[PDB]
Each structure stands twice: as structure tokens, then as C-alpha cells.
């Protein structure tokens, strides 16, 4: 079945070449789109705003994002996808025909497999959840409101797809599958209502099960002989400048971040500092929510500038877990309690 893969890869290369030639003055816009589409923004900006606006959209958003990350990371090891910047120079399709010209940017050279496309998936899921929740409100000129929101959602998705294709980092089918998978995950979590009134026991057990399954699957794959670092050899000789390749010594960097965010949300929701400020409080009015949002955003942006050391794997893992768990605590329990006490005078 190599012929189908070769045809898809050739179509991806042709699309990348066409975009890189006919659209020369769109580098900055595509770089901005690719850098905004990081999920750090989803966990640092979109969650504090929505949690203090509806108290239920934030939970669904965080759950969808974490599960999308988990699924992306798990399927990355087994899907065995390739990226356009090293396929064009390491193939045999163009053996009797001219090789198409592909240009690499400092954002192009990447070290991981590119099959699940963990940029369009998270954006698709998060923005689908946000749009569906927004249209859930204002239910009772609604037809005019539906189409504008859906056009905006699809415009964002198309821009993300074009940005990933332009930088020669993905093929169209990978990004399309990522978008569809994100939509499917969001719709699946649309039908679960037992994730709201859950104690700390459920959160701890779910986090433990996810961590154990990921570690066991990785060890099982490594034991059987399945290659897992097959891409480090390719993103070392086909990159035009060696300075553009940043080797990774922490393969479990993002799984622990996701588990930390989940456990931090679980701890923050089940606390005395929460049901005394955000719930059952006399001084609950819209300026209080706005002040909490502003303070949370500013303090989280300030706090983001702390980088744990990477010299020791255990220390790095523990500090990453702690720093990822701090955000929900500060955004839910600590800051609103302080504003309730200070502003309650």
C-alpha cells in the first residue's frame, strides 16, 4: 500500500510548494497563527475567563483539552507519520523527475512524528466547545448568530491548517484527521454529565489510571522492539542549519503537565477556599468576577516566566507537575478568596 502513501505525500509536497511560491508576504501571519495555536494559551487565558463567566464551560474545556493531549500523545508512538521537510530529500519518488523545491524556516525543523497533528486537534476541540457553549446561552435573530459563529470557527480552523501546511511541517490529511478527531472528542465529552459533581477520589483514580496506562504502554512498546526515536536521525541531517534542531531529553514532558492540570483542578474544586468565595457568598456580583478575571490573567502571565531546570529528570518532572497544578489552584481558590476578603469591606 506504498502507492497511496506516496501519492498523498506528493500531493502534500505540491501544496506546500504552491503555498510557499504564490504567497510570499504571508510568513508573519502564518507564524503568528502557529504560535497562538499553542495549548498553553488554552490553559492560561481561555480557562480563567470562561470559568468566572459560566462556572461550567471551563471544566468541560479543561477536560477536553487534557484528554485530547493524552490521545494525541498515545497515538503518536504508533501512527508512524512523516513530515514534509525530510521526506522530500529522503525519498525515491523523484528519481527520474525534477525534485520540487521546498523552503525551510526556523519553525519548520521538528523532532517528533507528525501523524496526529496535535495543533489542529486541540484548537478544534477547544473552539468547538466554546462555540457550542456560547450558542447554548442566548437560546431564548438567533439564525443570524449561528452562522457568524460557525463561519468564525471554520475560518480559524482553515487558518491553522494553512499555517501548519505552509511551514512544511505537516501534510493535509494529517491536519484534517486532527481536526476531525478534536471535534469527535469534544462531541463525546458533550454527552458526559458525571464530570461536574465528582470528589477528589475520582480525580485521583482517573489521573493514576491515565499515568499508569501511558507508562505501561510505552514500556510494552519498547520491550517488543518497536522503534520510538526513529525521527531524531531524520531531523539531524535534513535540517539546513544545526541550530534549528533542539533535541529533547524529557519524553514525558507534556503528560505530566496534563496530569498536573487535572489534579490541580480536582484539588481546587474540592476545597474550603472555593465554596467560601466562588460559591455561597453574599458579595457575588459581576465587577467581582471581572476583577478576579483580570487579576488571574495578569498574575498567571507573570508566573509563566518561571522555567524549571532540566538538568535532572526527576526534579524537572516534579517541578513541571507542580507548576502545571498551580494554575487551577490560583485561578479558582486562592485569588478569588483574596479578592472576596479585600473587596468585601
Swiss-Prot record:
EC numbers for this chain: 3.1.3.9
Topological region Cytoplasmic: 50-60, 197-203, 270-285, 336-345
Lumenal-side positions: 1-28, 82-117, 163-173, 225-248, 307-314
Membrane topology per record: Multi-pass membrane protein
Effect in UniProt of substituting residue 203 to C: In GSD1A; complete loss of glucose-6-phosphatase activity and reduced enzyme stability
Cellular compartment(s): Endoplasmic reticulum membrane
Cited SUPFAM superfamilies: Acid phosphatase/Vanadium-dependent haloperoxidase
Impact upon substituting residue 76 to N: In GSD1A; loss of catalytic activity
Residues annotated as the enzyme's active site: 119 (proton donor), 170 (nucleophile)
Superkingdom, natural source: Eukaryota
Main location, first listed in the record: endoplasmic reticulum
Swiss-Prot/TrEMBL catalytic activity: D-glucose 6-phosphate + H2O = D-glucose + phosphate
Glycosylation sites: 96
A Gene Ontology biological process term: steroid metabolic process
Reported impact of residue 116 to L: In a breast cancer sample; somatic mutation
Pathway: Carbohydrate biosynthesis; gluconeogenesis
Residues in the signal sequence: none
Class in the EC hierarchy, top level: hydrolase
Chain sites annotated for binding substrate: 83, 164
Record's GO cellular component terms: endoplasmic reticulum membrane; membrane
Transmembrane segments: 29-49, 61-81, 118-138, 142-162, 174-196, 204-224, 249-269, 286-306, 315-335
Disease: Glycogen storage disease 1A: A metabolic disorder characterized by impairment of terminal steps of glycogenolysis and gluconeogenesis. Patients manifest a wide range of clinical symptoms and biochemical abnormalities, including hypoglycemia, severe hepatomegaly due to excessive accumulation of glycogen, kidney enlargement, growth retardation, lactic acidemia, hyperlipidemia, and hyperuricemia.
Family the UniProt entry places it in: Belongs to the glucose-6-phosphatase family.
Summary of the function given for this chain in its UniProt record: Hydrolyzes glucose-6-phosphate to glucose in the endoplasmic reticulum. Forms with the glucose-6-phosphate transporter (SLC37A4/G6PT) the complex responsible for glucose production in the terminal step of glycogenolysis and gluconeogenesis. Hence, it is the key enzyme in homeostatic regulation of blood glucose levels.
Protein name, UniProt field: Glucose-6-phosphatase catalytic subunit 1
Organism per entry: Homo sapiens (Human)
Organism lineage: Eukaryota, Metazoa, Chordata, Craniata, Vertebrata
